[PDB]
Amino acid sequence: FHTGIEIKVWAIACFAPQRQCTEVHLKSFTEQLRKISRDAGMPIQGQPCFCKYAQGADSVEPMFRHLKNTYAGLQLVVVILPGKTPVYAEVKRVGDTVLGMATQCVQMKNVQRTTPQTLSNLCLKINVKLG
Amino acid sequence: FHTGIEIKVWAIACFAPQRQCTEVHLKSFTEQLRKISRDAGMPIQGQPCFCKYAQGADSVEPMFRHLKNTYAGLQLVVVILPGKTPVYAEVKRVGDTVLGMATQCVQMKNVQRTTPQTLSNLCLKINVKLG
Amino acid sequence: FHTGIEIKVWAIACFAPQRQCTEVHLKSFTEQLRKISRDAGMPIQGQPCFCKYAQGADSVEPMFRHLKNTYAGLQLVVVILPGKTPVYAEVKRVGDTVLGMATQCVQMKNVQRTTPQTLSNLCLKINVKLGGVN
Ligand SMILES: O=c1ccn([C@@H]2O[C@H](COP(=O)(O)OP(=O)(O)OP(=O)(O)O)[C@@H](O)[C@H]2O)c(=O)[nH]1
Ligand SMILES: O=c1ccn([C@@H]2O[C@H](COP(=O)(O)OP(=O)(O)OP(=O)(O)O)[C@@H](O)[C@H]2O)c(=O)[nH]1
Ligand SMILES: O=c1ccn([C@@H]2O[C@H](COP(=O)(O)OP(=O)(O)OP(=O)(O)O)[C@@H](O)[C@H]2O)c(=O)[nH]1
């Protein structure tokens, strides 16, 4: 576990349908993630600079280029996926091999209803990636 | 206080529920404990060789037997307790009398919410036991 | 450097909070100071007669008056400070000019994490201060 990580600039891109993963699910998940990451010594220091819905793998590269071109110092994009989807491969293609943007994916079902264990799982993955 | 102690091989046995005491709580606690123990000259070196959840006093002896048989040179088992529980008495019976394995219990609340004072308390007890 | 020093009656006053300078920090620092001072022939002997936390410059004079009255033959008060603080000036006012008590200050960072070099720095300062004095 890495100490001294602070996440100051981050975004959320939700590829799950809004009707299944609503704004209140996203805001609850956001605040619960911020709380446990601060508890663990990896504080997420503010609200995401960007939190929007996207549909389809075709939206990945334009949205990520937009993020890179709009938010200086972006550290992480949290990507909500609706189950198994071709969106995953495209997010990793653009993030890992095109633009060099750290991404962390999370399943829609763990945003609709968080648990401490699944928030912990996400925190540890982020800590490894940014550490 | 005894100088010259080095804790190379150690384990965590968490008898508190994972939903209350998550993996990222355990890993963050571990790093804070490593830091203060190193500063005080009794370094708890490396990650634990073993870190697993269990439930119930009846799980103590099977788990501790596995630890003793599996990790030669094991020096300490850190045991996380869910409040007041028969787990404590069984940990002391199995550790001190049945198997001969040094153990140090810590309350779940002090893993969920670490403070320098409670980490210091833990180091001093570990120092007495291993010194 | 004076040979033949034996520091038998000494105290610790910690003006940094316990949250910063914990019990295990104090006890580790004490044992490591005891070991190096013995090896260098100026042994700081035994546990301190007094080891307590306090806060603020106003707490200095009551505590030092208590120390002077309670522990006859007190040779040294080791004073742990968080850094720059008005407590330092008060420690030296009360110790040097009011009560005539030897004090040696140490920064809390060097109690939180001792090193041989900073323990040596402290022993040399104590040796100058107490060597030859009565
Ligand atoms: O189609 C998919 C694929 C994956 N996922 C979910 O994405 C999450 C993994 O998302 P990650 O961001 O961790 O991908 P990664 O493993 O490639 O990152 P590295 O640490 O290896 O660099 C997992 O939770 C998985 O269930 C989906 O939800 N749908
Ligand atoms: O039922 C209990 C009993 C004890 N404990 C917790 O065990 C911890 C002590 O854990 P120890 O490992 O230090 O037990 P010990 O026998 O070696 O030390 P002493 O108690 O004799 O001083 C304490 O922090 C206590 O809160 C429980 O949580 N539940
Ligand atoms: O405000 C302060 C002042 C000093 N100190 C620390 O006190 C230590 C020295 O404390 P001393 O106890 O050795 O003072 P002194 O006899 O040398 O008196 P003068 O030199 O001022 O005449 C030094 O290590 C310094 O960092 C503080 O921590 N805070």
Q: How is the secondary structure organized here?
A:
The structure is a homotrimer.
Chain A (H helix, E strand, L loop, with lengths): L9 E5 L8 H17 L10 E4 L6 H11 L5 E6 L5 H13 L3 E5 L1 H4 L3 H15 L1
Parallel strand pairs in A: 1-2, 1-3, 3-4
Helix pairs in contact in A: 1-5, 2-3
The complex binds uridine 5'-triphosphate (3 copies).
PDB class: rna binding protein
Keywords: MID domain, Argonaute2, RNA binding protein
Assembly: trimeric
Report what the structure shows.
Chain A is an alpha/beta fold and 131 residues long. The first copy, chain A, has a single domain, classed as Response regulator (Rossmann fold), CATH 3.40.50. Chain A contains 5 helices and 4 strands. A 4-stranded parallel β-sheet of chain A has the order 2-1-3-4, sandwiched between helices. In chain A, helix 1 crosses helix 5. The first copy, chain A, is globular and about 35 Å long. The relative contact order of chain A is 0.23. Chains in contact: A-B, B-C. At the B-C interface, helix 5 of B face helix 1 of C. The structure holds uridine 5'-triphosphate (3 copies). The site of one uridine 5'-triphosphate has 10 residues of chain C, from strand 4. Chain C: Belongs to the argonaute family. Ago subfamily. Chain C: This is Protein argonaute-2. Chain C: It is found in: Cytoplasm, P-body; Nucleus. It is classed as rna binding protein.
